[PDB]
Design an enzyme around this catalytic site. Structure first.
Site, PDB file in Angstrom:
ATOM      1  CG  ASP C 754      -0.267   0.156   2.531  1.00 61.86           C
ATOM      2  OD1 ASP C 754       0.908  -0.250   2.650  1.00 61.86           O
ATOM      3  OD2 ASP C 754      -0.899   0.677   3.474  1.00 61.86           O
ATOM      4  CE  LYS C 823      -2.559   5.527   8.773  1.00 61.36           C
ATOM      5  NZ  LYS C 823      -1.848   4.244   9.015  1.00 61.36           N
ATOM      6  CG  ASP C 983      -4.972   3.084  -0.035  1.00 59.12           C
ATOM      7  OD1 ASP C 983      -5.547   3.564  -1.035  1.00 59.12           O
ATOM      8  OD2 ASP C 983      -3.780   3.319   0.255  1.00 59.12           O
TER       9      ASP C 983
END
EC number: 2.7.7.6
Lengths: 324, 192, 1062
Positions: C754, C823, C983
């Site tokens: 990812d 994040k 993702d």
DNA sequence: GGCCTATCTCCCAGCGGTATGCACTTTTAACAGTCACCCCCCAACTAACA
DNA sequence: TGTTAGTTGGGGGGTGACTGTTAAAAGTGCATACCGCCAAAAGATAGGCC
């Protein structure tokens, strides 16, 4: 969108009606918004003390200018009355305060319910959201919090004619009868002291003391009349069945009944309780064809206490805190 | 003494009074004739006549409507809410009575079960005239006593006739339910 | 006796005269209509045709045929649904009766349309009956509506079925010529069954024996630029094959069919047994006797309701009679009992229940119809012929994709029903809910049954008050809840759709035909604007959507199995008190001023039910192979179809699932397993790959101890960021190293790749920004780059300079800004910035750490977002210009009254579902009046606030989906298993090298096309090429032609980047 | 054009109940000469309901 | 298996029907204005009004 008293004759009669002759003059009188002034000078000249509560800091110099004597009779403090003990979490900004700290600074203490009144409050209701202010006061009264934690306080605020008519209503004028009327008529004793048109009062805005003179023409176009209300809480309100732990069920029952007004009491009791409605309504002494509209407030209290007193069944209610 | 409009005098409508009063006139002009054509002649007369008489009869009926309005006003002054409740109860009773009469008329005019006559019923239908009595109830009592005095040997023929009439009733009943399915009285069937 | 019999005979003959009169007398009196009467078989200009020809009834019914015989109101669509249902329910006389009653009245004749006559004409096209067809033709010409193709088709079917004279059919077909009705238009593009076109063919063959339909044999190929290679004949390809033999895949289809023909699945609970009595048997017996009483009551109520609504259909009124005859009584009662069983103690809304009951009824109708017809057997034959491509020991002469093999074989049409209109659904659900409340009845006092004889309802109707508004909910009696909890149910029940499939899912060949064998499933799972997405999908050229359909089929074909070793540990914790920090929820009974203790128990009682459901479903599939279907939302994001047992979720969900087919590790697989373990550890995130591998070699004994003794050991795996996945990797690496040969060991463990933030990667690729393409790993370097550290540093600088001013929110947050909160803030800002909703999550972390004062959380989150937004403006260059241009274009499009629409590079059209409030309509009744939003209202207009803040993230989402689809389609040809989870890209450890090549090259080939400039030329044609109002078109044309200039960054260098995906 | 006013997380989620007003069907009581309802135990039936 | 009730025939009575004009009650299905405040953060922005 605020208003005060700036005249002298009206301030004089308000000062005379605020304090009675048998009442003790050093009894602390809390003014919820002194405003620019004028009224507080009349209250000082009357002979009683004052505790001043001003929301806007802008007036705090002028209010400090008076009371140069060290007697402590004026005692100006910065807070807002209706934002006392905010339920929403957050940092308590200087407009917002806790009742505990304010009444610790004032030096006043706790007095039991079955006793004489600790204080007296004069003030005025907001222009918008009178319903919300009355609801918050009812929540503070039924469950003893905020101001009402110490003793039994009165309020002597002003109210509009629409909210006045929606309160104090009963069977006889049945159309305006609603829940807030019932809770306030059980909660306290209501009297009317004085009525005035809105033109006599000053008008005020955020930019300055409201300079629009056609706004007086808007005051006449609304033609609103203001009432003075005395609200003295009742001694025998907190019955063994109606306690500060049981008030939410009573509020739910009143809101459920005054929803779907045209129905009978039995039809609502079918949803509210598993017990037999015929038994309850014959027990209180009334009939099945009765509508909820033509039922007096004391029968509402008696109905709630009649349901609550029964101990035969394990489940008497269909109100859990989930419904909140 | 009645809250309903029967106890006072209700004014007949002026046009309605015209159509009412023309009926005895042509009844006397045509004795023993069918009113089927009398009312048709009345309707033809009313359709042929101009609207001026209708207008003056409207004015007359308006005057009677005003006097009926003041009569209803003074009656409501006399009325009590308990009397209003009693009036509503009488209205519901009238609705139930007319519903019962209407359903009975629909049952009778249309095909209806006439259930079989029992052995005693056949005995009554046959030997009622032979019995003698001062009153019909006495005659029925004598027929009942004689029937109780009858033995089963004479009762066998009556039971046979009752069974035959039961058979004809059952066949007529299946034919009636088929015909009434063809007519569509879904209420007039057996539930199961 | 003779006289009485004679009188009876005279009265009887009078009754026959009366009945003959009633048959003769026309039904023109309303007092007779007030009574239930027989079915009816037979103005100045409307009645001109019927007044003469019907009276002199023709001796020959073949004469007077067709031409020789010479947006809806809302109530009308209900009548159309009534007739369309009476077609299925085999009650044509009822529909004919209602049609003649509505035709008689002048007020009821207006709302009839030609389709309502055509439905009855088609109903009597079957089974012959020329008389009624002629009567309906008379009625149509009385109305004045000129006949259409379907009426001629119905007449042809009738004469074909009765096989009457061919000269009459030839006369019929000398008509319909000189008019525009072309014959081949009957057979295609008209919704009629196969038997209908067969009978029409039988008629035409007798008329014209040379009539043959066009075959249209060869299907087309996509031949687009980005999809040329995947659909090219000239190439070397090695398609994968499943490991199981053909017979096992033949047997699994029967199990799936048996599971889907019934609508329920029963699963044993994982709760601790209560075999000791403790008076649970008394509760269990009372439940049984009550649950049989309720069943009898429900059957009686259903029969009474049906017998009332049939009388309502008579007397000329619409009602729901044919809808309750669509299913058997036992199935409706069983569905109602199932719905009553799965009822929360709190209660649900009335409208939610109502809807639930309507959707379930429609689903069971759709499944049952295929049983009464013959499509199940045809599906069995096609599936058994299809399974040869997807199985071992079975060879196809030529290699091809599963969709191509599905369509190369003769495929059944598999026709499906159009959905019911919304009012019918709402009224049917409300009626069934009323039946449930007014049929179930329960004793009042349960502890002492003989003491009381009062009977009370089970379900109560109550009001929940919020602000001014009231919501009507249904609440169970608390004694029923206490009885339910006192007894222990050893069985839970799921639907068939909510459970993973046991066979390979059906291929995606159309936006309607798809994953489940019999149940219907749509491509786009959007409630808002549901019709427009489907209309755009069916409008497009046929070759546009092959890439998305093939990628979804490939994602559906993946085989899965359950990791039972992790499962044992999880249920070991579950049955005990458990550990809440790892993820296993504690029981509510263990947890404990009154409102606080009421709420804390409520939240864990909410969570533990979901945990129990997932664990029980996992234990049910413990030893089996299963498949998960997929679909996509309007942005292109691919989600699995089952609601809760999808492979997405938390760590405990992904820990239990692994691949079913194994590939050998090869020379380099075990290094990748070690690097994956270090990646899941959470440490060494700023290091090259060799440092990660050296750290893995240094912690060998720790991972072996964590594998051999998971709970009794030193507990190293709990300290990792994601513990369960680390434990699974520990077991796999231990088994790999303890083997004799490290290579030739079959591993069934997925490996993840990812990017850091693919949104920032796509902005850097679009703008060709050098600084951005260095910040995210698009430039080759020996050390990885991390965006979150830089964003945290910039936010710390801004907060420190704000703190000197004395702002409280700046100085309260000290020592609290961490990587995790940065994040979450960045993920909220870039993705899903529409209607900021990650703030709640942004709150959670700030609430979770204990040193922070809790009451300050609400002001804190709103602060943080602003800062990171400003930080993302400072660091990145092209992101600012691109976001500004997209936002301005969305604003100017929405101001013109048009929702934003575009087309992906792979050909999939995308439109945004944001519109203002629609007109809500109400239904009255006994218990309550219900209100509903009416979907598809024209008066709905764009919501500029939502159509502005939504355009920049949705475009990036579509680019993400396009890149994933390209990577999947180009990894299929090399024989690799590919999964896409959130993702992350999952592949076997052996191939993570070669996949890492493909994932780069496609990124160079997607971004070597003018993505922005094709928008610039497409949006002007769609939106700015209209002459109706040029005033704003002139303004919008410049900003539609204003595309930001590219920078100076070489895209081909991404091919050599070794930390682009890591 | 510039000032001032009103609003925000879940997509889920959706509000219910009274009183008023208005285009359109049905539909009844009023009069009457004269034959249908409704009764009564007797026993039986018995379809229907619980 | 256990309980209900309305028919089948009796007569006398009152009470309502078959022929119909009159003209207003009377009933249905929509559309729409208006109550309820259940108690409750700060800031930036966009729309609406003058």
């Amino acid at each position: 969108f605020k208003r005060y008293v700036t005249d002298r004759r009206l301030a004089e009669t308000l000062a005379q009606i605020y304090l009675g002759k048998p009442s003790r003059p050093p009894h602390l009188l809390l003014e919820c918004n002194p405003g620019p002034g004028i009224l507080t000078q009349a209250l000082l000249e009357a002979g009683a003390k004052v505790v001043a509560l001003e929301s806007d800091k802008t007036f705090i110099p002028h209010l400090e200018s008076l009371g140069k004597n060290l007697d402590g009779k004026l005692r100006v403090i910065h807070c807002d009355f209706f934002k006392l003990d905010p339920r929403s979490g957050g940092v308590i900004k200087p407009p917002a305060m806790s009742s505990r700290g304010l009444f610790k600074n004032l030096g006043i203490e706790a007095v039991p319910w079955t006793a004489d009144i600790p204080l007296k409050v004069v003030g005025m209701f907001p222009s918008r959201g009178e319903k919300r202010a009355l609801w918050k006061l009812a929540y503070d009264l039924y469950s003893c919090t905020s101001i009402y934690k110490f003793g039994r306080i009165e309020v002597n605020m002003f109210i509009g004619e629409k909210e006045f008519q929606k309160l104090m209503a009963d069977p006889g004028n049945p159309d305006l009868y609603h829940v807030l009327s019932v809770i306030w008529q059980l909660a306290c004793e209501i009297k009317v002291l004085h009525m005035e048109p809105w033109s006599s009062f000053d008008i005020y805005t955020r930019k300055g003391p409201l300079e629009n003179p056609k706004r007086r023409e808007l005051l006449d176009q609304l033609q609103q009349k203001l009432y003075l209300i005395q609200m003295i809480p009742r001694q025998n309100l907190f019955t063994k069945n109606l306690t500060p732990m049981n008030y939410n069920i009573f509020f739910h029952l009143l809101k459920h009944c005054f929803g779907r007004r045209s129905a009978t009491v039995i039809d609502h009791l079918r949803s509210l309780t598993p017990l037999d409605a015929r038994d309850i309504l014959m027990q209180i002494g009334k009939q099945e064809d009765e509508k909820v509209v033509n039922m007096h407030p004391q029968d509402f209290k008696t109905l709630f206490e009649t349901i609550e007193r029964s101990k035969d069944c394990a489940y008497k209610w269909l109100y859990d805190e989930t419904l909140e | 003494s009645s809250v309903l409009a029967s106890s006072p005098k209700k004014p007949v409508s002026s046009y309605l009074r015209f159509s009412k009063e023309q009926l005895p006139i042509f009844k006397a002009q045509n004795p023993d004739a069918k009113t089927t054509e009398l009312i048709r002649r009345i309707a033809q007369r009313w359709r042929e006549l101009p609207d001026s008489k209708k207008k003056i009869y409207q004015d007359a009926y308006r005057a009677e409507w005003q006097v009926y309005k003041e009569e209803i006003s003074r009656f409501k002054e006399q009325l009590t809410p308990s009397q209003i409740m009693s009036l509503e109860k009488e209205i519901m009773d009238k609705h139930l009575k007319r519903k019962a009469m209407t359903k009975k008329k629909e049952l009778t005019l249309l095909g209806k079960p006439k259930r079989p006559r029992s052995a005693y019923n056949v005995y009554v239908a046959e030997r009622f005239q032979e019995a003698k009595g001062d009153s019909p109830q006495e005659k029925l009592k004598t027929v009942k006593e004689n029937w109780k005095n009858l033995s089963d040997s004479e009762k066998e023929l009556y039971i046979q006739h009752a069974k035959e009439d039961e058979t004809r009733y059952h066949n007529e009943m299946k034919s009636w339910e088929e015909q009434m399915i063809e007519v569509g009285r879904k209420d007039l069937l057996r539930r199961t | 006796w003779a006289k009485i019999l004679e009188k009876d005979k005279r009265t009887q003959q009078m009754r026959m005269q009366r009945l003959k009169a009633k048959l003769q007398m026309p039904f023109q009196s309303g007092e007779f209509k007030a009574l239930t009467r027989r079915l009816q078989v037979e103005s100045k200009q409307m009645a001109g045709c019927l007044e003469d020809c019907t009276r002199q009834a023709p001796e020959s019914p073949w004469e007077e045929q067709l031409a020789r015989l010479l947006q809806l109101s809302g109530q009308q669509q209900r009548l159309l649904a009534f007739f369309k249902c009476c077609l299925l329910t085999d009650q044509l006389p009822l529909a004919h009766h209602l049609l003649v009653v509505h035709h008689g009245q002048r007020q009821k004749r207006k709302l009839l349309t030609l389709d309502m006559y055509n439905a009855v004409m088609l109903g009597w096209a079957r089974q012959g009956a020329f008389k009624e067809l002629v009567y309906v033709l008379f009625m149509v010409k009385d109305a004045g509506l000129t006949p259409d193709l379907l009426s001629y088709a119905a007449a042809l079917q009738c004469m074909g079925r009765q096989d009457q004279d061919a000269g009459t059919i030839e006369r019929c077909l000398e008509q319909m010529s000189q008019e525009g009705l072309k014959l081949q238009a009957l057979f295609t593009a008209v919704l009629l069954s196969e038997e209908d076109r067969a009978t029409v063919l039988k008629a035409v063959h007798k008329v014209k024996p040379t009539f043959s339909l066009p075959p249209q044999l060869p299907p087309p190929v996509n031949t687009s630029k980005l999809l040329r290679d995947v659909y090219a004949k000239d190439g070397r390809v090695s398609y994968p094959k499943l490991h199981l033999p053909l017979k096992t895949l033949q047997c699994l289809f029967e199990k799936q069919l048996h599971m889907e023909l019934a609508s329920r699945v029963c699963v044993v609970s994982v709760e601790k047994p209560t075999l000791p009595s403790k008076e649970v048997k008394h509760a269990r017996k009372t439940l049984k006797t009550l649950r049989d009483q309720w069943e009898k009551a429900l059957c009686r109520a259903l029969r009474e309701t049906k017998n009332r609504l049939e009388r309502e259909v008579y007397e000329g009124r619409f009602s729901l009679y044919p809808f309750l005859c669509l299913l058997d009584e036992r199935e409706v009662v069983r569905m109602l009992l199932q719905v009553l069983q799965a009822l929360p103690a709190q209660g649900e809304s009335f409208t939610t229940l109502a809807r639930e009951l309507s959707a379930r009824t429609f689903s069971r109708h759709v499944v049952q119809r295929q049983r009464v017809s013959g499509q199940v057997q045809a599906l069995q034959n096609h599936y058994r012929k299809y399974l040869c491509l997807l199985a071992s020991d079975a060879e196809v002469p030529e290699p091809c994709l599963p969709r191509q093999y599905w369509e190369e074989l003769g495929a059944p049409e598999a026709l499906r029903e159009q959905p019911w209109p919304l009012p019918v659904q709402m009224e049917l659900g409300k009626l069934l809910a009323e039946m449930l409340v007014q049929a179930t009845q329960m004793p009042c006092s349960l502890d002492k049954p003989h003491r009381s004889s009062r009977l009370v309802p089970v379900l109560y109707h109550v009001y929940s008050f919020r602000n001014v508004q009231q919501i009507g909910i249904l609440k169970p009696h608390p004694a029923y809840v206490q009885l339910l909890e006192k007894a222990a149910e050893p069985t839970l029940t799921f639907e068939a759709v909510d459970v993973p499939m046991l066979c390979p899912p059906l291929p995606w060949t159309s936006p309607h035909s798809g994953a489940f064998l019999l149940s219907p499933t749509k491509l786009m799972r959007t409630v808002e604007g549901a019709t427009q997405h489907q209309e755009l999908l069916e409008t497009c050229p046929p070759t546009a959507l092959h890439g998305a359909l093939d990628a979804l089929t490939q994602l559906g074909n993946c085989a899965w199995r359950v990791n039972g070793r992790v499962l044992d540990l999880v249920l070991q914790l579950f049955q005990a008190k458990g550990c809440p920090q790892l993820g296993v929820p504690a029981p509510p009974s263990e947890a404990p001023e009154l409102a606080h203790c009421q709420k804390v128990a409520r939240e864990m009682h909410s969570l533990r039910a979901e945990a129990l459901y997932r664990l029980s479903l996992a234990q049910h599939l413990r030893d089996r192979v299963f498949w998960l279907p997929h679909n996509m939302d309007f942005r292109g994001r691919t989600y699995p179809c089952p609601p809760h047992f999808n492979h997405l979720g938390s760590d405990v969900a992904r820990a239990l699932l692994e691949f079913a087919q194994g590939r050998p590790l090869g020379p380099h697989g075990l290094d990748w397993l070690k690097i994956h373990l270090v990646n899941l550890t959470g440490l060494k995130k700023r290091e090259p790959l060799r440092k990660r591998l050296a750290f893995a070699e240094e912690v060998m004994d720790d991972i072996l101890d964590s594998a051999d003794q998971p709970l009794t050991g030193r507990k190293w795996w709990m300290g990792a960021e994601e513990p369960w996945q680390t434990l699974a990797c520990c077991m796999e690496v231990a088994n790999a190293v303890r083997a004799s040969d490290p290579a030739a060991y079959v591993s069934h463990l997925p490996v993840h790749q990812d990017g850091s933030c693919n949104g920032l990667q796509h902005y850097a690729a679009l703008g060709r920004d050098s600084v951005g393409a260095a910040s995210v790993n698009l430039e080759p370097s020996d050390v990885p780059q991390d965006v979150y550290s830089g964003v945290a540093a910039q936010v710390e600088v801004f907060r420190r300079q704000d703190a000197q001013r004395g702002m409280r929110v700046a100085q309260v947050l000290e020592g609290f800004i961490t990587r995790k909160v940065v994040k979450q803030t960045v993920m909220t800002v870039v993705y899903g910035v529409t209607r900021y909703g990650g703030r709640l999550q942004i709150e959670k972390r700030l609430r979770e750490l204990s040193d922070f004062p809790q009451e300050f959380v609400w002001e804190a989150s709103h602060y943080l977002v602003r800062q990171v937004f400003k930080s993302l403006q400072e660091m990145f260059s092209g992101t600012r210009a691109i976001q500004h241009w997209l936002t301005e274009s969305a604003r100017l499009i929405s101001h013109m009254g048009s929702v934003v629409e575009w087309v992906t590079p792979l050909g999939v059209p995308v439109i945004q579902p944001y519109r203002l409030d629609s007109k809500v309509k109400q239904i009255g009744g006994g218990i309550q009046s219900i209100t509903y939003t009416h979907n598809g209202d024209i008066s709905r207009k764009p919501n500029t606030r939502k159509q502005k803040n939504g355009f920049p993230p949705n475009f990036i989402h579509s680019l993400d989906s396009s890149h994933m689809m390209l990577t999947a389609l180009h990894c299929y040809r090399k024989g690799l298993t590919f999964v896409s989870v959130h993702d992350c890209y999952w592949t076997h450890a052996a191939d993570v090298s070669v996949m890492n090549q493909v994932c780069r090259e496609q990124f160079v080939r997607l971004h070597s096309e003018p993505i922005l400039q094709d928008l610039s030329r497409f949006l002007v044609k769609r939106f700015c090429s209209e002459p109706q109002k040029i005033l704003e078109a002139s303004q919008l044309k410049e900003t539609l032609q204003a595309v930001p200039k590219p920078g100076a960054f070489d895209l081909e260098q991404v091919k050599r980047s070794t930390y682009f995906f890591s």
